Design a protein around this ligand. Structure first.
Ligand SMILES: Nc1ncnc2c1ncn2[C@@H]1O[C@H](COP(=O)(O)O)[C@@H](O)[C@H]1O
Ligand SMILES: Nc1ncnc2c1ncn2[C@@H]1O[C@H](COP(=O)(O)O)[C@@H](O)[C@H]1O
Ligand SMILES: Nc1ncnc2c1ncn2[C@@H]1O[C@H](COP(=O)(O)O)[C@@H](O)[C@H]1O
Ligand SMILES: O=P(O)(O)OC[C@H]1O[C@H](O)[C@H](O)[C@@H](O)[C@@H]1O
Ligand SMILES: O=P(O)(O)OC[C@H]1O[C@H](O)[C@H](O)[C@@H](O)[C@@H]1O
Ligand SMILES: O=P(O)(O)OC[C@H]1O[C@H](O)[C@H](O)[C@@H](O)[C@@H]1O
Ligand SMILES: O=P(O)(O)OC[C@H]1O[C@H](O)[C@H](O)[C@@H](O)[C@@H]1O
Ligand SMILES: O=C([O-])C(=O)[O-]
Ligand SMILES: O=C([O-])C(=O)[O-]
Ligand SMILES: O=C([O-])C(=O)[O-]
Ligand SMILES: O=C([O-])C(=O)[O-]
Ligand SMILES: [K+]
Ligand SMILES: [Mg+2]
Ligand SMILES: [Mg+2]
Ligand SMILES: [Mg+2]
Ligand SMILES: [Mg+2]
Lengths: 471, 471, 471, 471
């Protein structure tokens, strides 16, 4: 089966009966909850449908809370919507108002103070484009250079302009709280610019007495300028291509993507590639050739996971989008699971041992590679390498199974907390023998460690035949 | 400035005044003429607009005549158009009729004879999908499984069906004739399945007493089965992804693409990657992130040329599409012009010599690599390798400059037919000195051959300082 | 201290009291007992002085019994020694006689029968060369073409003439018996021509109910023609350059040597390079520059062991010879322990596991690599790879320690037969902690296997800190 | 046939009739003239016999004048030779004496002034070793610690003790003058310690108005400490292993040798490996297995040339020594001519062009590589790479043919100074076609340059069929 993992975003198109279920059945590995949209009741109901379907199918399904971050927006228009046509003069004010066609508010209150004649304003990820002509007191006077519909609270971007704003807004703090309490497995922060941003997220987590892995969304120049530091301070990264391709020139994105994936894999952190991978499937039952290409190349780049946004959240073919993404990933992997080699020899015990384990399993035509992990790390150091062999993570911490739902190639098995390595290995035999797929005599390579139940204690590789007396 | 070449398709959106001119000024290297649409007067007028703009700007612009081939189609409906909704029963007959919703003709007369219950019919390249239920004499009874509008003479595709049909129809023969006489520099044949197909194209060329390079369009499984033989019998190949992605499962296309490009480069034949690279720019001023990726990755794959179809032929942003494709290609090449290495060491004299010439130029920080060529071959054996240095082809055959407009990284200079290599070299100095770019003292590496004016006599490499007495 | 092993041959110059002891103290790893020379009493006495010195110093010292095989020889001269000068006529007879300058016996009784005028006779490995002029009844009449001293029972070689003679003579069978019962650790067979030769040696071993590893000496073309098969049927090989350099053109020996060493290492069998490595030290206190080169280059070739013959057996500087060979080996290893890479990736479980163990140890700056071995194999699969880390074999079978005395870079530790791997590892800690070299906290990488005490069960690698509770 | 070059030293054993001739006929490429020994009349006579035999056979033979340098020596004994046995007390005096067993003069007059108890004195390159016990006035009182024969004017070495002595003595200056005027092609300087030493040799050359290439003999640690700078300031280097193996521990010589050869080849300077390569052939008709190895491994190291010293100069088998060295070199090359790759990509025009020329010739199965050279450089940059193809240097300077006698794999052809490259190529065809061996139609690859007759102008490669009109 498929190795590369699939992240799906939930929304109106996944709300009806049995749709969340059918997505899990079709292969969804992580469900994204977008806190830019919806009320807490919608998110509750959806969280529940994921848990049910996960538990009922037996498939792991992580739940990802995506926080809006310091997204700058327009306010409200008197009609709810207007049309901004090429050639029109429009004012965007930091003063309060119900907007109209001619004059509308924004949420960023430093706009008149930070925007200068010449600056470009892109709306809703680039559809509508303005150029700033002047700042008159509170108003930024602009000319529509590319026309289109604008509506209430649509997002805007000021490329190159330096935005001042806290990494977490008060809204994000409340959403993070709601999300932690409700049980989500991972958290994504929009618009990260600094490694220190993760500290503020942890500050909230600790007040509430609950940490989960934090994903840095990459969609700002500052973030790419600090890519290594952010990859190291955060637990995963998402190449967030939508905003990234307006905050940076869109022509720079393909290579940023590839550098971000390599850097994640060098440091054994998960990476998700997001946004418009199958955009046209919002309206159509089959994607474009660009889209099919984009997906396959994301796999070849070495992405742990690929994401669907409006394709599943608001589109007309949520299911077909997931199956389609899965067919493409599988076509590529059947040919080869190879990923770009690492540019360093492993130095950490867990890295070196997981790298050796891979060598061993492949060179002996082993039936699976198995690694025990308490925090996920030992598995992530193997996953990053890619291998055509099954990679089965074993753990006694349930949440790690959900967290590893976004790690390449990896199936997770929950087992009791064992106090010996012999016991870890008996647990492997038991879990595997319940599967039609494995039988006595099957050769596997097991990575484990003592002291048991200690993160990072990983220190042994054992070649084992299932059921046989060789331990 | 850009190395990878851009092919644009002409149609209604480029008929408007001085649009062809603006495309050449924006970077168009080859103009595609699609004989599936338009009358001979349209194609004449457009050919002329290209010649004018080429000659007036000083930019080379090849003209590519694209022949429809044995394209299967529906006939005509009494209303001109209908809606085929999921659930409905439709008959496709090999008998003649003015169609209706329920019953419409097809041009493939073996359809009732070659279709079995269960076969799939994709219409309009997949915006309508039917399954064959039964054959009653002349009629193929189907059920619409995916619904949409159909109109007069829309194309259909019957995946996996073994189609019997001549490589050239009588229409293609008359179009090929019209095109050869009108002066086109290259010819593309749709739906190639065999290396023998090129023989029929040559048969017409020879009757008319005019040969040009023949591009095999790859959009059939039979073509991929025979990829090597077709690459070797034809002068170029085009990865024709639109039809390829219905004739093959769409998920298989990305890897076919990459192996087709490799195979072209191994044998020093041009390759064009075509179709939906920037599809959404038909409606929008900026492409999707999948589209930007698809373009960048076409460059990294090693493609000589990338193509725009409806993006320039019928869309709202023909210019912006070209500029946008050019910005993306340039972003990638600035990082590196590196292409996947060849999987053999060059054996032919011209290959070995062009490979050495590159070694020399790069190792000595030469300003340019310069190669004399009568048919283009010597230059194509260098182009395929990629290099960050300018690659300047020199020739005395005008048509070769146009033919090399689709070869990677290559600019061509026409000069008189010389009777010595010393003379070839004097001509280099003279042509180059008229350029703001070059100056006396500039070191360049020149490939040439004696006997002069004989294809494949290439046998000399000279490291030369422009204007200096070192020959 | 030194990794490459040193084999010394015992004889008259090592018979004095505690010279055997001083050789062990100077570095001797294997003592060669040459059954071409000496009484059973001499070999007994010397075997015992080796056991004593080994047990008294604590250093491992293998004892290698070298069987003469089908060696052709001269008989006795009335003076004991003579000079055969260029130009002289000499008779070598198969009749028994008082030998003199003019006429001397030989042991090969088919000589007069199988010699043709023109056959060449090389004496004492080529210090004297004769050509056969005629056969008169029992005498082969020759002319000295290259002159030199000859003595009693010196060997002869008849190149090209294919000799008829059993692989083991009746004398070799009795010597093999005497040697097995006396306790020797290894057996060498001179003049091997076939892989089936090892079966005859085993036939004797099995009659007597005691096997030891059999070294094939390579000094016939038939042996080089069958190198791979012999390396696989025998347990070790010796490049026996003395006879090899007359049976083959001497100019072909250096490359045969190198191929034979590579072949041994590919199949994890020990290889010794023998004869004239420091020949001049028979008479002189310091070797030639050729000799010092020949030793260094034997190390770089990848030899497990280098041997001294007359340098220790009959010469004036047995001790200095050993120290000198050791200084040279050490100078080379201090630079690098690199050996030519193997031309295949490991496939046997023990090969794959030992190769991984090396990777792990080096990458984690381990203090040693430790491997449990019952037959030696697991350790030989690591030794062959070379590594700058100590390679410590653990075993419960004493004779294995002596057998591994000829395996590169390897020290052995005897410990009790354990019934678990935990127990094997406790034994590592205990053995090592007694030593100045190791202390608690020291990182080591241990290879072991279950089921315990089973040859080839090797199946685990454990990264262990000495004395700490991580098992 | 043989690529590696063979240097022979002339002396008493080559004064015998027609011996110089027979050496040239057997393969000698360079004749070494050792100014440590002989009258100017002997060196004249021998120079002449080399010129004659070179001109009579048609074979190139360089003449190398070897300057004694600051060599410290014993004086004369009143038998001409004595035996210094372990345990004896010996005096070495800086004063005048009747020289005997007990007391002998030395040439180094600072010896009593520079010697401390404990200093070691090695004689005749180490075949007698003494330790200094005291200095009494003019005498250095010693104890023979390693015994052996000593004779008149044997050299001595004082390791660690820093000797004061001019790089060129008065004698060397006169010998250098005599040698330049007599016509020698190259000069070797003994005991080089500094790159500035070559300046002093040039200073003499320039006074006399004639330069030849200077070989730095490497036999002091100071020279190895400065290896790169010396290889760059001098035109060639000789690994002078005799003195180097007493001035350094002999165990360190083999690795110095290999590093010195690599360093020579990186900078396109010739390297000779000298001394005791086949030492035993002084007395014996066949060498040891160490010796045969030492020669083979010198070839594999990448030595341009190997040298014989006493093997030809004073020994009993000068001819057989040369033939034997040639057999061994050929045996190795028949297997492969490969040399250790260079650790840099070529940057100099001539390096890059010669490296390309090699690529081209081998990839096209050319019959030869031909390079024009005025100073030899262009040919040395190719030779260093090794190739199995004939490498034929062309030049208009006769002395260059003799100089290139010690460059690997290289045969030279003298031709007129030409005014064009077309002309250089006509001359190739003419010179080659006079040979039975070459024939019209043969493909060859020629390296040449304009402006003509200018060192370093090398700037073209031409692939040429002999006799055909392709230029
Ligand atoms: N099911 C389990 N029972 C006990 N310990 C475990 C279990 N799974 C993992 N561990 C421990 O967690 C370590 C791996 O944690 P980590 O290095 O963070 O991946 C292993 O070496 C084990 O000691
Ligand atoms: N002291 C010991 N006690 C029990 N088994 C041992 C001991 N030493 C080596 N072995 C066994 O020998 C196997 C490796 O031997 P070999 O296949 O010859 O390398 C290991 O897997 C162990 O099971
Ligand atoms: N026969 C010749 N006539 C004229 N020039 C020559 C001849 N042989 C060699 N040369 C010159 O020697 C140069 C190579 O010199 P070098 O850089 O020292 O190898 C070439 O570029 C030639 O121009
Ligand atoms: O040496 P490796 O196993 O490849 O680990 C590479 C890097 O990644 C990890 O995430 C650690 O945070 C780093 O300290 C480490 O240097
Ligand atoms: O050796 P090369 O110059 O790279 O040529 C490789 C191949 O390319 C050419 O296109 C020819 O079709 C082949 O006959 C040739 O073998
Ligand atoms: O290097 P390996 O994969 O462990 O193979 C080692 C080879 O030599 C061993 O000594 C065995 O005799 C062979 O069965 C084996 O193929
Ligand atoms: O780059 P190459 O052609 O190999 O030259 C390598 C070296 O050789 C010469 O001896 C030059 O003096 C160096 O400056 C040069 O870098
Ligand atoms: O946040 C995102 O997904 C984006 O901006 O593409
Ligand atoms: O013909 C084409 O270009 C296609 O179908 O993609
Ligand atoms: O047997 C030997 O030792 C030899 O031939 O050198
Ligand atoms: O000068 C030499 O040749 C030496 O010392 O070896
Ligand atoms: K067409
Ligand atoms: Mg975003
Ligand atoms: Mg098509
Ligand atoms: Mg022997
Ligand atoms: Mg010397």
């Amino acid at each position: 089966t498929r190795r590369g993992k699939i992240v799906c975003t939930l929304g109106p198109a996944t709300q009806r009966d049995d749709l969340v279920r059918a997505l899990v059945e079709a292969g969804m590995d992580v469900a994204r909850m977008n806190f830019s949209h919806g009320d807490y009741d919608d998110h509750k109901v959806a969280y529940e449908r994921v848990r049910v379907a996960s538990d009922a199918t037996g498939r792991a399904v992580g739940v990802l809370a995506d926080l809006q971050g310091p997204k700058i927006r327009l306010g409200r228009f008197a009609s709810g919507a207007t049309h901004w046509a090429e050639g029109e003069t429009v004012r965007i004010t930091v003063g309060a108002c119900e907007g109209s066609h001619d004059r509308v508010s924004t949420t960023y209150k430093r706009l008149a103070q930070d925007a200068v004649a010449g600056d470009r304003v892109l709306v809703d990820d680039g559809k509508v484009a303005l150029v700033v002509d002047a700042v008159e007191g509170d108003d930024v006077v602009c000319t529509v250079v590319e026309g289109g519909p604008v509506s209430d609270n649509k997002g805007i971007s000021l490329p190159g302009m330096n935005v001042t704003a806290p990494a977490l807004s008060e809204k994000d703090i409340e959403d993070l709280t709601f999300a932690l309490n409700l049980g989500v497995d991972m958290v994504a922060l929009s618009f990260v610019r600094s490694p220190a941003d993760v500290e503020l997220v942890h500050e909230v987590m600790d007040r509430i007495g609950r940490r989960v892995p934090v994903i840095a969304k990459l969609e700002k120049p500052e973030a790419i300028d600090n890519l290594e530091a952010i990859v190291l301070a955060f637990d995963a990264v998402m190449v967030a291509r939508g905003d990234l391709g307006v905050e940076l020139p869109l022509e720079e994105v393909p290579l940023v993507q590839k550098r971000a994936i390599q850097m994640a894999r060098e440091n054994a952190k998960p990476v998700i590639v997001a946004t418009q991978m199958l955009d046209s499937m919002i309206e159509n039952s089959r994607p474009t050739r660009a889209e099919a290409s984009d997906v396959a190349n994301a796999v070849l780049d070495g992405a742990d996971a690929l994401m669907l946004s409006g394709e599943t959240s608001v589109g007309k073919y949520p299911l077909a989008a997931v199956r389609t993404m899965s067919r493409i990933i599988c076509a590529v992997e059947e040919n080869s699971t190879a990923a770009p080699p690492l540019t360093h020899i492993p130095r950490t015990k867990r890295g070196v041992i997981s790298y050796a384990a891979r060598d061993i399993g492949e060179r002996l035509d082993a039936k699976a590679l198995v690694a025990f992990t308490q925090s996920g790390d030992t598995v992530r150091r193997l996953a990053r390498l890619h291998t055509p062999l099954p990679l089965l993570a074993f753990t006694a911490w349930p949440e790690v199974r959900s967290q590893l739902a976004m790690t390449w190639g990896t199936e997770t098995f929950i087992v009791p907390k064992m106090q010996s390595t012999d016991g870890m290995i008996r647990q492997v035999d038991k879990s595997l023998l319940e599967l039609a797929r494995y039988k006595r005599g099957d050769l596997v390579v097991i990575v484990a460690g003592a002291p048991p139940g200690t993160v990072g204690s990983t220190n042994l590789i054992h070649v084992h035949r299932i059921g046989e007396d060789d331990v």
